Design an enzyme around this catalytic site. Structure first.
Site, mmCIF file in Angstrom:
data_model
loop_
_atom_site.group_PDB
_atom_site.id
_atom_site.type_symbol
_atom_site.label_atom_id
_atom_site.label_comp_id
_atom_site.label_asym_id
_atom_site.label_seq_id
_atom_site.Cartn_x
_atom_site.Cartn_y
_atom_site.Cartn_z
ATOM 1 N N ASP A 90 4.646 72.038 71.597
ATOM 2 C CA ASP A 90 5.696 72.320 70.624
ATOM 3 C C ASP A 90 6.839 73.198 71.134
ATOM 4 O O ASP A 90 7.927 73.143 70.552
ATOM 5 C CB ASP A 90 5.067 73.015 69.384
ATOM 6 C CG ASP A 90 6.044 73.166 68.231
ATOM 7 O OD1 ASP A 90 6.468 72.100 67.701
ATOM 8 O OD2 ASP A 90 6.352 74.313 67.859
ATOM 9 N N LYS A 92 9.882 75.210 71.911
ATOM 10 C CA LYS A 92 11.262 74.766 71.796
ATOM 11 C C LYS A 92 12.051 75.251 73.010
ATOM 12 O O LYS A 92 12.718 76.272 72.955
ATOM 13 C CB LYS A 92 11.871 75.308 70.488
ATOM 14 C CG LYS A 92 11.149 74.899 69.217
ATOM 15 C CD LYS A 92 11.155 73.405 68.988
ATOM 16 C CE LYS A 92 10.423 72.968 67.648
ATOM 17 N NZ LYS A 92 8.986 73.336 67.705
ATOM 18 N N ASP A 95 16.966 77.274 76.646
ATOM 19 C CA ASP A 95 17.495 78.340 77.477
ATOM 20 C C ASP A 95 18.326 77.727 78.602
ATOM 21 O O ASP A 95 18.379 76.510 78.782
ATOM 22 C CB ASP A 95 16.325 79.183 78.025
ATOM 23 C CG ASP A 95 16.624 80.643 78.228
ATOM 24 O OD1 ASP A 95 17.783 81.010 78.520
ATOM 25 O OD2 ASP A 95 15.639 81.411 78.105
ATOM 26 N N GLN A 209 11.958 70.156 54.797
ATOM 27 C CA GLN A 209 12.211 69.063 53.877
ATOM 28 C C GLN A 209 11.385 67.870 54.319
ATOM 29 O O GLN A 209 11.334 67.567 55.510
ATOM 30 C CB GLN A 209 13.678 68.666 53.893
ATOM 31 C CG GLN A 209 14.611 69.815 53.616
ATOM 32 C CD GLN A 209 16.045 69.416 53.726
ATOM 33 O OE1 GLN A 209 16.566 69.253 54.840
ATOM 34 N NE2 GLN A 209 16.692 69.238 52.607
HETATM 35 O O1 LIG Z 1 23.604 82.022 76.587
HETATM 36 C C1 LIG Z 1 22.686 82.641 77.111
HETATM 37 C C2 LIG Z 1 21.581 83.219 76.419
HETATM 38 C C3 LIG Z 1 20.700 83.956 77.106
HETATM 39 N N1 LIG Z 1 20.789 84.164 78.467
HETATM 40 C C4 LIG Z 1 19.734 84.909 79.148
HETATM 41 O O2 LIG Z 1 20.221 85.978 79.910
HETATM 42 C C5 LIG Z 1 19.596 86.015 81.208
HETATM 43 C C6 LIG Z 1 20.632 85.746 82.278
HETATM 44 O O3 LIG Z 1 20.062 86.066 83.525
HETATM 45 P P1 LIG Z 1 20.958 86.114 84.849
HETATM 46 O O4 LIG Z 1 21.741 84.819 84.943
HETATM 47 O O5 LIG Z 1 21.871 87.340 84.726
HETATM 48 O O6 LIG Z 1 19.937 86.275 85.916
HETATM 49 C C7 LIG Z 1 18.452 84.991 81.171
HETATM 50 O O7 LIG Z 1 17.207 85.609 80.874
HETATM 51 C C8 LIG Z 1 18.857 84.045 80.017
HETATM 52 O O8 LIG Z 1 17.841 83.645 79.090
HETATM 53 C C9 LIG Z 1 21.802 83.582 79.211
HETATM 54 O O9 LIG Z 1 21.918 83.710 80.424
HETATM 55 N N2 LIG Z 1 22.704 82.864 78.474
HETATM 56 O O1 LIG Z 2 13.144 69.323 63.161
HETATM 57 C C1 LIG Z 2 11.981 69.643 63.370
HETATM 58 C C2 LIG Z 2 11.395 69.828 64.658
HETATM 59 C C3 LIG Z 2 10.084 70.080 64.742
HETATM 60 N N1 LIG Z 2 9.266 70.201 63.638
HETATM 61 C C4 LIG Z 2 7.863 70.565 63.823
HETATM 62 O O2 LIG Z 2 6.980 69.675 63.201
HETATM 63 C C5 LIG Z 2 5.949 70.385 62.486
HETATM 64 C C6 LIG Z 2 6.089 70.124 61.002
HETATM 65 O O3 LIG Z 2 4.921 70.588 60.367
HETATM 66 P P1 LIG Z 2 4.640 70.263 58.826
HETATM 67 O O4 LIG Z 2 5.867 70.651 58.025
HETATM 68 O O5 LIG Z 2 4.334 68.763 58.735
HETATM 69 O O6 LIG Z 2 3.447 71.101 58.539
HETATM 70 C C7 LIG Z 2 6.085 71.864 62.878
HETATM 71 O O7 LIG Z 2 5.192 72.211 63.928
HETATM 72 C C8 LIG Z 2 7.546 71.969 63.374
HETATM 73 O O8 LIG Z 2 7.795 72.714 64.572
HETATM 74 C C9 LIG Z 2 9.780 70.094 62.356
HETATM 75 O O9 LIG Z 2 9.107 70.217 61.339
HETATM 76 N N2 LIG Z 2 11.115 69.802 62.306
#
Ligand SMILES: O=c1ccn([C@@H]2O[C@H](COP(=O)(O)O)[C@@H](O)[C@H]2O)c(=O)[nH]1
Ligand SMILES: O=c1ccn([C@@H]2O[C@H](COP(=O)(O)O)[C@@H](O)[C@H]2O)c(=O)[nH]1
Ligand code: PRO
Ligand code: PRO
EC number: 2.4.2.10
Lengths: 257, 257
Positions: A90, A92, A95, A209
């Site tokens: 699952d 998500k 990044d 929903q």
């Molecule tokens: O838009 C985004 C959101 C978050 N980060 C986070 O910031 C850090 C950037 O690391 P660096 O490129 O400075 O090593 C990473 O952990 C990354 O998840 C980004 O770089 N950009």
């Molecule tokens: O747009 C999305 C993407 C993923 N899920 C996933 O599907 C499952 C839905 O569970 P339920 O509402 O059938 O219990 C959850 O694990 C949730 O992360 C959604 O419900 N909607």
């Protein structure tokens, strides 16, 4: 135009993970993915064994599994092989590419070592896919892009959904389909998996929903239903899983004429 | 119009987590958040101790921490209290509300038990915030919404960014600011944290794009720089952290006249 799952498994451009899935869907007459949103390994494995025959896929949720170990995953793989279903994690992924590469391969969970399928949000741009791809692994793996969401206020609409479809096209060596509410690509090699599914109208109190299997598979053109609470919170889980399986399967058949 | 961090800490509508952060930023003359993208607890804690005096915040990445335990977190909390910085977990919460509630509280990591700050993507709609809020905890906690991303092809633009700002406004009892590339809200109670920062022009080979501290704080109006590789991959980490701290701090001062 519309092809059975078994015929789609033979398409020239099919990905090996998609082909394996489509073949077992046809064999078992199931297009149901169980969303195993549970906190204990015991229950995860009980669900996998009891419902394995009814499902094409089990969606794990390791971030809430209080007693995760890789030995639990090994036992899940045994059940997946025995009952013939794929494992979809699952998490998500959402990044920058450099981070998703680390998140997919590493940490305690080592997701890439056991998950046939993962899903990613497209908001970071295509580096989200390229980073997942960069993980070196000599196993067959696929990714699903989240092109639409089921929840109230979702921003995965319009040009965002179109961007997800283009990203998938362009990375079809690894992207095998979508999380979506409807068919979003006309290319039959791609899989459409739809969450937000229950037999009854409604929702939850946190923006989920629901639509029915007949609506999402039959009218909206999706391939697989993802069902959590409709099964796992039911009084009789096997009965519920079979009702969902039969609903989704018939709805699919109705499009083959 | 433009207020110092110390004055912003006293604003009538300030959230307690934001106030605590702003006060320590002013006291220590730092608006640097270290991105501790490391795989071992030893190194996480070495960074926290050595760089603690130079930073206002440490961004943990528990999904890649191979030897995570809650005892590691307890030792990080001790360092955060001693050196005076907040703990921000990287996990990209990006699910339906019912799932993010479980992900924030539960699993092995129990993120809500130790993270002062978390961040969420806005793509699911406002249930992503409502689900995090629903976790019962008698501690001060905040959330940052990802309004823009630093990576090539980011879809967090235009109406998506505007939706993030509206969502934050509307949930200001818990949302304390943004991950963004620029100032996106005119309300001074909100914090703007900007990743994609390095002293030199460039990027990485997986879609990261860098801008300088002077650009993002001084010209684009953000508050805090988030820096990973610019520090953690440097030949001399303390020297690098101090260069980043001085750069971001001066750029901020330049807007106060
Ligand atoms: O838009 C985004 C959101 C978050 N980060 C986070 O910031 C850090 C950037 O690391 P660096 O490129 O400075 O090593 C990473 O952990 C990354 O998840 C980004 O770089 N950009
Ligand atoms: O747009 C999305 C993407 C993923 N899920 C996933 O599907 C499952 C839905 O569970 P339920 O509402 O059938 O219990 C959850 O694990 C949730 O992360 C959604 O419900 N909607
Ligand atoms: O692209 C591939 O096939 C391998 C498998 C996981 C990611 N890299
Ligand atoms: O809203 C609050 O204050 C609490 C703290 C974590 C989430 N719920």
């Amino acid at each position: 135009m519309e092809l059975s799952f078994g015929a789609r498994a033979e398409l020239p451009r099919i990905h090996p993970v998609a082909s394996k899935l489509l073949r077992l869907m046809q064999k078992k007459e199931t297009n149901l993915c169980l969303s195993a949103d549970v906190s204990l390994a015991r229950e995860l494995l009980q669900l996998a064994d009891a419902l394995g025959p009814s499902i094409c896929m089990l969606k794990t949720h390791v971030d809430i599994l209080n007693d995760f170990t890789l030995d639990v995953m090994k036992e899940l793989i045994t059940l997946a092989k025995c009952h013939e279903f794929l494992i979809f994690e699952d998490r998500k992924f959402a990044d920058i590419g450099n981070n998703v590469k680390k998140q997919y391969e590493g940490g305690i969970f080592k997701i890439a070592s056991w998950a046939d399928l993962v899903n990613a949000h497209v908001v970071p741009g295509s580096g989200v896919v390229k980073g997942l791809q960069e993980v070196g692994l000599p196993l067959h793996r696929g990714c699903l892009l989240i092109a639409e969401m089921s929840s109230t206020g979702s921003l995965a609409t319009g040009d965002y959904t179109r961007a997800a479809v283009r990203m998938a096209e362009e990375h079809s060596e690894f992207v095998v389909g979508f999380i979506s509410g409807s068919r979003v690509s006309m290319k039959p090699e791609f899989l459409h998996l739809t969450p937000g599914v229950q037999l009854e109208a409604g929702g939850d109190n946190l923006g989920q929903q629901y639509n029915s299997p007949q609506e999402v598979i039959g009218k909206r053109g999706s391939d697989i239903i993802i069902v959590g609470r409709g099964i796992i919170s039911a009084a009789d889980r096997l009965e519920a899983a079979e009702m969902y399986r039969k609903a989704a399967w018939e709805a699919y058949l109705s499009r083959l004429g």
